[PDB]
């Protein structure tokens, strides 16, 4: 039933693509977006989500060590 509500007035938006797009839209001359509905999508356990080649190169952690083991042994 309960949820404990991870709650509002916590984000204060600050999330850098939204902050730069508020910069661009304010220099455009609107200054009125929707707002802070997506800060949980842009920061938290997110925000330095990994890039493209890092996902492909996720596997060399045990790989190079085991390869050097197989070469030397």
């Amino acid at each position: 039933s309960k949820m404990e509500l991870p709650d509002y007035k916590q984000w204060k938006i600050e999330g850098t693509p939204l902050e730069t797009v508020q910069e661009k839209l304010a220099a455009r001359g609107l200054r009125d977006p929707w707002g802070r509905n997506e800060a949980w999508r842009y920061m938290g356990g997110f925000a330095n989500n990994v890039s493209f080649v890092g996902a492909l190169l996720k596997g060399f952690k045990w790989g190079f060590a085991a390869f050097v083991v197989a070469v030397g042994a």
């Binding site: 039933s1 309960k2 949820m3 509500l5 509002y8 977006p33 929707w34 707002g35 802070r36 509905n37």
Partner: protein, 87 residues
Amino acid sequence: DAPPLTLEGIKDRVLYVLKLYDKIDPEKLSVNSHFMKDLGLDSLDQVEIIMAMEDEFGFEIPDIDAEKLMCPQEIVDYIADKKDVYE
């Protein structure tokens, strides 16, 4: 696959994501608040609100309804029509 939805929790979720929206206050805002009369926001921003509810819950509402919600309680009533929010 369906987490247990109750009435008061989903009411708090709707009012929470309304409260996260900027140009209305958390101060003079309750369940029996209006969208045209006391807050005075337009129909265009009211449909931005309806789009926020649709994009959170994941289903549209028909345009036979689109004019005549105007308060969070009847929003909770229509979502209780959609999901049958009980045990």
